[PDB]
Amino acid sequence: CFDFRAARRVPETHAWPGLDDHPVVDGGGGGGEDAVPVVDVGAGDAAARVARAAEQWGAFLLVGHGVPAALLSRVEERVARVFSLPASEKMRAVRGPGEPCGYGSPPISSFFSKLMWSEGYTFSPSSLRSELRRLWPKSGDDYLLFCDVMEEFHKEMRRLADELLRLFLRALGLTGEEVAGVEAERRIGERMTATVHLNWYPRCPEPRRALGLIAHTDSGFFTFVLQSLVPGLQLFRRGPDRWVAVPAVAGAFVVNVGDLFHILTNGRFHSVYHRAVVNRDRDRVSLGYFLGPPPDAEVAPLPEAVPAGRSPAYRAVTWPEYMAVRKKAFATGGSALKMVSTD
Numbered sequence: 544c545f546d547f548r549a550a551r552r553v554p555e556t557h558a559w560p561g562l563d564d565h566p567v568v569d570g571g572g573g574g575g576e577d578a579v580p581v582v583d584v585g586a587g588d589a590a591a592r593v594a595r596a597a598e599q600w601g602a603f604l605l606v607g608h609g610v611p612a613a614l615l616s617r618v619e620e621r622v623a624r625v626f627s628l629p630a631s632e633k634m635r636a637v638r639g640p641g642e643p644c645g646y647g648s649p650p651i652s653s654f655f656s657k658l659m660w661s662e663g664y665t666f667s668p669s670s671l672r673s674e675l676r677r678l679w680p681k682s683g684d685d686y687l688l689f690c691d692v693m694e695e696f697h698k699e700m701r702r703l704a705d706e707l708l709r710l711f712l713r714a715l716g717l718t719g720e721e722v723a724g725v726e727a728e729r730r731i732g733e734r735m736t737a738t739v740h741l742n743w744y745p746r747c748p749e750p751r752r753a754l755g756l757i758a759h760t761d762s763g764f765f766t767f768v769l770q771s772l773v774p775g776l777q778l779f780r781r782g783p784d785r786w787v788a789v790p791a792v793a794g795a796f797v798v799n800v801g802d803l804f805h806i807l808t809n810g811r812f813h814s815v816y817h818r819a820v821v822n823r824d825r826d827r828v829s830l831g832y833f834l835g836p837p838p839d840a841e842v843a844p845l846p847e848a849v850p851a852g853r854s855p856a857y858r859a860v861t862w863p864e865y866m867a868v869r870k871k872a873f874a875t876g877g878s879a880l881k882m883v884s885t886d
């Protein structure tokens with residue numbers, strides 16, 4: 544389709560009016576009130592740092608996670624490789640209307656009239672080998688290397704995801720022994736599912752006009768973002784309204800808290816609104832690794848998160864139910880969280 548590589552300007556179909564409505568501030572370590580929080584997952588005070596970041600930002604940089612740097616670099620190379628394929632091959636794996644996986648813009652794109660300056664690809668790690676055969680129907684080197692790197696990455700990330708979930712629950716102020724009780728009763732970590740979305744943001748000749756990824760919250764529990772060392776992720780903060788530019792830090796993931804975790808925590812942990820901007824000089828690739836419940840599980844505020852005497856702030860919803868609420872929210876200009884809230 545549209546050739547991002549050849550465009551010498553951004554055409555009106557790809558031009559967004561609002562983009563500088565709010566100021567952008569630096570979120571590096573010298574950024575003050577707006578330095579993005581960093582959490583070292585192996586530090587003894589990780590739970591406390593996760594608490595503060597989840598409450599005040601809904602996001603944090605994550606270091607010390609143990610995922611080998613050599614593996615992360617191979618992941619980024621494979622991801623770049625998918626998007627350097629010819630258009631004709633990519634379209635062989637197109638994600639058709641309403642389909643969950645394949646090559647194409649993510650589902651938020653269909654709700655907006657202007658088009659994003661990026662490409663995407665969604666797959667589920669649990670059926671990676673079969674899904675990726677749509678892209679490489681005769682298998683071969685690129686296919687086998689891609690599946691090998693993504694399989695190993697999924698094994699490391701699913702473990703990290705279980706470690707982070709335990710930290711998030713501790714960060715509600717529960718002891719390790721109480722968290723074990725929650726996990727034993729609800730099996731949240733045992734049951735959560737992972738989905739991957741790959742993003743390619745090509746260089747853009749008029750960055751003030753184009754938008755890499757439409758501003759949104761993630762719908763699920765929480766997401767790990769792995770990105771090339773080119774900046775572009777921005778996190779919205781209020782009072783006053785502003786975008787915080789997340790720094791590109793070697794060996795960090797960014798964790799974003801999503802809507803269903805806002806529900807799970809009775810509103811305690813913020814679901815972060817975020818977007819990705821393009822840039823003039825460098826392409827960059829990112830991968831989101833999205834955690835959420837299985838399709839049959841109801842998500843409602845945890846009793847341990849609801850203060851004593853108080854009522855739950857949100858109704859119970861399954862993820863498929865909540866996706867329908869999101870779709871309605873996108874069309875009507877509303878907020879899916881408000882729509883399932885008890886007020």
Ligand SMILES: C=C1C[C@]23C[C@H]1CC[C@H]2[C@@]12CCC[C@@](C)(C(=O)O1)[C@H]2[C@@H]3C(=O)O
Nearest residue numbers: 649650651665738740759761762763833
């Ligand atoms: C598991 C997921 C999570 C999805 C839906 C599905 C696959 C792709 C994910 C994203 C990725 C990009 C933006 C978002 C808002 C989108 O449009 O697609 C995300 C969405 C969500 O957070 O709900």
Ligand SMILES: O=C(O)CCC(=O)C(=O)O
Nearest residue numbers: 740742768776819829831
């Ligand atoms: O590309 C980024 O840094 C944003 C990733 C993200 O927001 C997503 O893919 O949902």
